[PDB]
C-alpha cells in the first residue's frame, strides 16, 4: 500500500517550477550577484535545503517533473542512489521539454526566454560570490564538496539532459576557477612577494610587518592550492569522460570550454597533455565537432609546435578528403596559419595550393560553400607567396628597378607566377589528361579567386608584359617563352575579370589599373597567337563606357580599336567552329557595339564597306581554285559573317549579282576542282545572314519593300540553281564525298533561310493583302522538286555514315544507291550521329510547317529502329 501510494503520487505529479527556477527562468533584468548572495548565505543556514533547491533547479531546467525533498539530499553517501532514483523517474516521463536549451537555441519560441543567459551567468559567478562569502577555501569548503558530490553522478547518468546540464555547470565553475588561480598569482602573491622582498632592507625590516606579509602570502597560496585542487577534480571527474560523450553537443561544449581554460590559464592548459583533446576530436565522426575544433585552433595558435607536428597530417587530410565542404574550408583556414608559422613541408604546401584549380564552374560573386572554399585556398596561396618572397629577398638587395617596375614587384610577380605554374602542374597530375583549352579555363578561374590577394600586381604585370629587354639581371617565372606569356595573360585576364565581378568592390578599380596599359599591351603582346589574342581582347571586353570615362581613357578607345581592326584585318578566319580567334573577335565586335559610340561603330561600318569593295574586286578579277576559295573564305566571307552578327551587312544589287552569278551559282563546278580540305570549308552561311538583315527590315515595319524583296528572292533562286545542277542526272560527281559535302552545307543554309521566310509569311495579317501576296509571289512553292531530292540525298548520306559505324544493315527503297553501304567519313567535328540528328531535326522543322514532300520524306522513318535511341526520339 505504501509503495502503491508513492507510485500514485509519482503518476499524478505534474511540472511545478521551484522558486529559484522561477526567478532565474523569468527575470529579464536580474542582479545575479544579489541572487547568489541570498542563496549562498542560505547554504550556511540550512545546507540540506540549499542543496535541495540547487538540484531541483537542475531538474526544472531539463523539464523533469520529479523533485528531491530536503531529507533526500541529507546524506552525501546517498547521492549516487538518489540520482539513480531520479534517473528512473525521468526515464519514465514520456515527454520533456529541455527548457534550458530551448531558451538557448530558440529564445523567441521559448517559455523561459531569459533562462539560459541567467543560468550561465549564475553558475559562472556562483563560485566567485562563494569566495566573497569565504565558502570556497575555509582545505576545500564543504560547499564545493557538496556541489561536486551531486554534480558528478548527474554528469555520468543515462539521461542526456541531466548529463548536459551538470557538465555545463561544472565547466562554468571551471571557467571561473581557472581565471581565479592566475588572478591570485599575478594580482596578489606577486604583489605581496615584491613587497616581502622590498621590506627586508635597509637593516630596518619592520619584523611585525614581515610577519603580516608571510601571513597573507601563506594564506593566499594555500587557497591557490585549494582552487587548483577543484580544477584537477573537474578535469578528473568530468572533462576527461565528457569530452567523448555519445552526445555531440556535450563534446562541442567540452572543446569550447577547454579552449577557455587554455586562454585563462596556459601554464596549466597549454600543454600537449590537453591539446591532444583538440587533435583527437579532429577525427570525430560529427561534422559539428570537427567544425568546432577547427574554429578553435587559430585562436590557440612550443606546446603548439608539438601539437601541429602531431596533428597537421590529419588537418591536411581533412582539407583534402573531408565529406563536408564547410569543414574542408575550415581546415584550409587553419592551414593558413600553420604555413605562416613554418610548420609545412613543401609537398604538403603544393597539395593545398593546387586546390585553387578546379574543373567545375565556381562563381566568384557567390556566397556559396564552393566559392568560399576556393577563396580560403586563395588565402593559403597568398600566404605561401609572401613567405617565398621573404625567403628570396632575405639576403639579396634588388635594384630599384627590374623590367620597368620596382625590383620588389618583379620578384613578387615572378614568385607568384612560378607557384601558379608549380601548383598547376600538381593539379594536372592529380587528374585525367585535359587539353590546353580546359587547362587555360581552369587557370583563368583560379586567377579570378586570387584577385583579392594579387590585385595590386595587375598594373605591374601589364608593365612587365610590355618590357622589351631580356628577363635577367643578377637574379621566378617571367614571360620568357611562349608558354609563360600565355600563363601571364590568362592570369592577368582572370585577375581582372575576378576584380570586376567581386562583390562589394568600389567601381572603376580594375580599370584604373589596366586601361593605362591597354594600348601598349595590344601594341606589344604576340597577338598572332590566338591564346594571347583571346586573353587581351577579353581584358578589353571587361569594361563598360563608364569605366573608360571615369579613368580618363575614353580618348584611347579609338586608337585601341584601330589596332584591333588591323589585327582583325591581318588574320585569316575559319568558318567559326572551334576557332578561338573567330570567337574572340566576335565577342569584341559585340562589345564595341554595346558601348554605343557612333564614332566606333563607324570604324566597323567602314571596315565592312572596304571588305565589300575588295570582295567585288576579287570576284570580277579572280572568277572571270583551292587558292581562290581559300582567299574567298579566309579573307572575305568568314569575316563579313562574323561582323554580320552585330552590324548590318547588305550587298548592293551590283555586288550581290557579281557574287550570286560568278560564285554561288557556280559552286558545283568550282567544287569538283578543289581539294577535300578546301571543300570542307565551303558554305553559304553569309547568304543566310544577308537574308536575316532584310527580314529585319520587313519586320521593322509591320506597304511592301521592293529591292529588299528582289534581294532575297534572288538569293533563293540561287539555291534553286545549285539544287538543279546537283540533283540532275548530268551530275557526274554524284555519289562522292565532295558532292555530299556541297549538298550538305548548301542544304543547311537553305533550310535556315526558308524556315525563316515561312515563319515570317505566317506572321503577316490578312490585313496585309500586299505583303502576303508578294511573298507567295516570290517564294511559293518554298521547296522545289530538286530541293526535295537534294535534302533526301543529304539525309541518306548521313544515315549511312552513322549506320556504317556499327555495320548496321539498313533497308532501302529499290533505286536507293546501294553504294551507301560502304561510305566512311572521319571529318565531322563531334561525330556522324550528331550531324544525322541535326539534319533530321532541320527536316522535322520543315515538315511541321509542312513544306516537304511528305511522301518522299517518309523514308526518314524506314530505319528508325536501326539507328539508336536518340534518332528514334527525334522521329517520335
Author numbering: 88 to 225, 235 to 397, 408 to 581, 605 to 753, 761 to 838, 849 to 1022
Paper text:
Sister chromatid cohesion involves entrapment of sister DNAs by a cohesin ring created through association of a kleisin subunit (Scc1) with ATPase heads of Smc1/Smc3 heterodimers. Cohesin’s association with chromatin involves subunits recruited by Scc1: Wapl, Pds5, and Scc3/SA, in addition to Scc2/4 loading complex. Because all eukaryotic genomes encode orthologs, Scc3 is the most important of cohesin’s regulatory subunits. It has roles in loading of cohesin onto chromosomes as well as its subsequent release.
To obtain the structure of a more complete version of the protein, we expressed Scc3 trimmed of its N- and C-terminal extensions from other yeast species. Of these, Scc3 containing residues 88–1035 from Zygosaccharomyces rouxii (Zr Scc3) yielded crystals suitable for crystallography. Diffraction data were obtained to a resolution of 2.6 Å from crystals grown at pH 6.5 in a PEG/KSCN condition and their structure solved by selenomethionine single-wavelength anomalous dispersion (SAD). The crystal structure of Zr Scc3 reveals a long, partly twisted and partly crescent-shaped protein composed entirely of α-helices stacked on each other in a surprisingly irregular manner, given the repeat nature of the protein. In addition to a pronounced hook within the protein’s C-terminal half, a striking feature is a “nose” at the N-terminal end, a morphology generated by a pair of anti-parallel helices that are about twice as long as their neighbors. At the tip of the nose reside three conserved basic residues, KKR (298–300). Though part of this conserved and essential surface (‘CES’) is positively charged, it also contains numerous conserved aromatic residues, namely Zr H337, F339, Y373, W376, and F417. The highly conserved positively charged residues Zr K340, K372, and R416 all protrude from the surface in a conspicuous manner. Though S. cerevisiae Scc3 packed tightly as dimers in the crystals, those from Z. rouxii crystallized as monomers.
